Structure 1
């Protein structure tokens, strides 16, 4: 509260570390469904159903231009990628499985790096 602060958790490396994690996700063999925004002109249903589209290129641009205020808003957009994927894709499809694999991969890097 006013003039009463918890000790300062060092956040000065967060940008570098989120960038490293994102590189690792970009270079995963199962990243291909997530590298670019879904083409809303060419994929029936996507625009109406998926209220907040998100992809790794869009997260990379946001990260590079100071549009994440903290590491939690970064994790929210990564999870949005996989939450959208589960919304639109069957679990037993190549893309559905890719999204599960990537989410697992992310969450381990996240825990190991920050928790």
Structure 2
């Protein structure tokens, strides 16, 4: 509350560390469904169904331009990528499997870097 604060957690490396995680996600062999925004002219149903499209290149641009206020807003966008994937793709598909694999990969790196 006013003039009452928990000890200050060092957040000075968070930007660099999120960048490193995102590089590792970009270079994973199962990243290909997520590298670029889904083409809303060429994929029927996407635009109407997925209210907030998100992809790794969009996260990279937001990260590089100071559009994440803290590490939690970064994680929310990464998770959005996988939540959108599950919304639109069957589990038993190459893309559906890719999204589960990448979400697991991400959640481990996240815990190990920050928890």
TM over 0.5: yes
Alignment of 1:1-115 (within 5 A): 1-115=1-115
Counterpart CA distance in 1 for 2:20 and 2:42 is: 32
Unmatched tracts of structure 2, length 5 or more: none
Superposed CA offset, 1:82-110 (max 9, x none): 00000000000000000000000000000
Secondary structure of the 1:24 match is helix
Unmatched tracts of structure 1, length 5 or more: none
Q: TM-score, normalising length from structure 1?
A: 1.00
Superposed CA offset, 1:19-41 (max 9, x none): 00000000000000000000000
Q: Quote how far apart the aligned CAs of 1:6 are.
A: 0.5
Q: Quote how far apart the aligned CAs of 1:11 are.
A: 0.2
Aligned length: 115
Q: Quote how far apart the aligned CAs of 1:70 are.
A: 0.1
Q: Quote how far apart the aligned CAs of 1:44 are.
A: 0.2
Superposed CA offset, 1:59-92 (max 9, x none): 0000000000000000000000000000000000
Q: TM-score, normalising length from structure 2?
A: 1.00
Q: Once superposed, what is the RMSD of the aligned Cα atoms?
A: 0.2
Counterpart CA distance in 2 for 1:114 and 1:4 is: 24
Counterpart CA distance in 2 for 1:4 and 1:30 is: 46
In the TM superposition, structure 1's runs of 4+ consecutive aligned residues that sit over 4 Å from their partners are none
